[model samples]
Target: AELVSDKALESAPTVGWASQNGFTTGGAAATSDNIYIVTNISEFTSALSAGAEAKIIQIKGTIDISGGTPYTDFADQKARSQINIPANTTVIGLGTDAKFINGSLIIDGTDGTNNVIIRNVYIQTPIDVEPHYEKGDGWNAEWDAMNITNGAHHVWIDHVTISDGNFTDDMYTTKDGETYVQHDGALDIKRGSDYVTISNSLIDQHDKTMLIGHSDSNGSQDKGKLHVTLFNNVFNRVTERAPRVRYGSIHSFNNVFKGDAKDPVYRYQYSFGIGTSGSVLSEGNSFTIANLSASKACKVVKKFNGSIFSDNGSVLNGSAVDLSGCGFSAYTSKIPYIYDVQPMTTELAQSITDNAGSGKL
Candidate 1:
């Protein structure tokens, strides 16, 4: 990918699975004419509607789409509580100053939504004003900060922050003593999305962090899709689904998963949830129990009739862990290309924590 003029695209991380598999992200091939800057919701909406050519959008300051805004077209886009990101586009924030408040960034559409890059922005969780409550599954909020669904492929999300925000007391308590989780997922790759990479990001204080495959019954669309690579990221105080999978081949390496500080509403449930037809190769990841009590030990993997998984050279609580008790098939030959797997160490964990989010870009 040649960046003719845009320096931002030249510096963005292009190192994971998305760069492979015939996927290259370049907005107008980084041409000088296609570079655009956005400072508010209206300008951002205009940039999105500026033809299907590869265009680079640079976000500056904070754009709030929480409630009704004055921008008519963006207000309609905000009606769905999300901004639809399209193909061959790169949206990069200006360091840590760029942020999106109270809406999701969605990349979908089977035909044209491919080769996209999103980097260095903080996306606050959406507030579901009209929540749908179920008897068994409490309150269900509908948006993910970034969602790649419906056969969308070849995407990269780097140096971004996805976490819970704008929560009130009413969001947690149910009328009948249940719980209402006002967020769905931080980042999700579902419904046959493929060739994606989530690297150098922070997914913190969020429930259902990442869902690689949406449902167990989606074998038709997902059996050959959902190929994702997760590296150099930190799952800080995240509850579950540090990418729970169904029918994907997930390569998770050089990441950190640490527990919270005694929060009852959100605590560790299970990371690397493996479901039917899923295969995960988790290597060199660091998992820490942190302040969790001995009674609530760190539960890493929850297997539900998955295909196979391997935990190679990983450390738990700063020591090598034996995952033989989890009863996984323990290996895979699905990944075809060779990749660099950094060893999990204390310094690497500290580095990932220090420089994985929006401010570092």
Candidate 2:
């Protein structure tokens, strides 16, 4: 069943989009092939690898993955501090207290993985106690909280809180004071991934929030791929790229962008970045700048070379902002699919604030 009507999906929702699309019934009421109730990391990992059968993996309590050392894969020559979720599985947290701390979640679809649903869980990075800083290799010390990459498809992430853990103030300058890179992205959707939906989530206080495609030269694998729908989410103090799109038909509506005026880590960049060959259709979203300086510095969307961004019914600081000059080839009705269009209102920020994130029902 389609989550939203053509009109409602295209615009902001008066009510929210949580009950639409495949979200109408998550693991709660679905008749899956199997159901696993897990309370720890080992059980959760085992449940995720239970083959391709339809399964619902319910999580209870907090699963802390930082007690031990980071796992290094000799095969891939990479160090990982995350858990992997297999395909055709649904993971739901028991309540507001159910969380995954000090580790990331990897949804790898390299071997034809698909059909995954993640909801009501808090995912956070480890606290940067020591100066885990490697200058140009800070990301090597930290990884993305939730990574959905490597040809993944048909995924839905809802009502989850993804944060930068306790390292929110871990910014140190270089000798000449160039840049200080701290945490990585909260979530990333790249590597030819498609048909993904992120709704009712709070992605907050991170340097690189979300990235759509891996790189600028990934057009061969990304062009005509990476179809994403972002609705009813709160992007709070997230430096830049609530999602930097590349070679995707990204539909963003009914979202809130809360900027930080005096953040020391990184200056506020644009909310949305239209990367190479990307087609971003934005509507009914709200942007709240922290101060007058931020109001002048913040832009609704940043344009790359070969991207197209079209905006309608978006607001900035209680006023309608013009997005007609976002990029070349200004507007197009050629979206990948059809959905209902809900007109945006000034109360979008409050509505998202009231209902977005893990604890909210």
Candidate 3:
């Protein structure tokens, strides 16, 4: 039977199982190296969840929900982000303006050894400020731009922008019917992950920008060995340290931090102080603390005093400067990115925390 456009429009026949669109192998042919381009929003979840063998995935085109009834205001918008990526998949956004609006992309790394590459994308979480209202804790948590978890490794997050006033408003709690502040990072790494790199990303108004190691009893403990590197990231209007690195080998370099009066980039431990039990290196960074506070300059070797980097102005100088209690040796790297500067291995990591503590996750 011949079908015309007018007949099809008038009949409005339902698409059945035998139809061409039904249960089609939606992605490209499975090869050792496969690339899938997701153009439409509806194809995102099914195409991505297809398998763990796809080597490369690119999310292109405009995901514009800015039409009438704006996607954020509708409940259905949040459900669009159940897209799943397989193991060893490199997913890159077409451009920085490729927008993922009004919800979090929850990446479940449960399938296998998943290595994800995310770059140049804009992810937005919702923000709401109401009198005595909190969001995000189990059932009530409505949004996050991206949540990564469940024993993943070699995750590289770079050049991405994420925000939400809703996440900020949720961080408030009431004591005696009075609301107070709480800090929650936009990006969270739980379970045991190794070789994680977060660099050159823009985070604004996120209470705590990035959390490296989490201490959750419900999740897997003994986080094996976590190697985290944060470099060249920009934090605008952040309330906490751009990143809080705990129980890991961390190197912070060449980053710009701008803080308000309430929240300064206060490192719990630096080279000179009784620092966190890891290889902590900070160099070539600038800090702007609130005007009323002590100082806006970046303070390294905070606990111990000695030859500060001479290129930048020093707070202390000469033989009067004490370097005795400084926890780490004053090591210089020839390059800005520390991971590339030296070869890092798990065996060397074991030596650092041998007598320090257990359940180091």
Ranking of all candidate structures by their TM-score, best first: 1, 2, 3
lDDT for each residue of candidate 2 in 245-304, tens digit (9 for 90 to 100): 888777888888877556665456778888888777778888776653423532657777
Q: Please, what are the lDDT tens digits per residue for candidate 3 over residues 45-119?
A: 445665666444555654433322444432454444334556555555664345565445554567664456555
Judged by TM-score relative to the true structure, which candidate is superior, 2 or 3?
2
- Provide the RMSD of all predictions against the true structure, rounded to 1 decimal: 3.6, 6.0, 14.9
Model 3 error, position 350 (Å): 38
User: Which pairs of residues clash in candidate 3, taking residues 3 or more apart in a chain or in different chains?
Assistant: 104-144, 127-165, 127-166, 128-166, 136-141, 272-303, 272-304, 273-303
Whole-model lDDT values for every prediction? 0.76, 0.68, 0.44
Best by TM-score: 1
Q: What is the lDDT for 227 in model 2?
A: 74
How does each model score on TM-score? 0.89, 0.82, 0.59
Prediction 3 global C-alpha lDDT: 0.44
Runs of candidate 1 with Cα error greater than 4 angstroms are 1-7, 11-15, 67-80, 166-178, 291-298
Once model 2 is optimally superposed onto the true structure by TM-score, how far is the C-alpha of residue 160 displaced, in angstroms?
Answer: 1.3
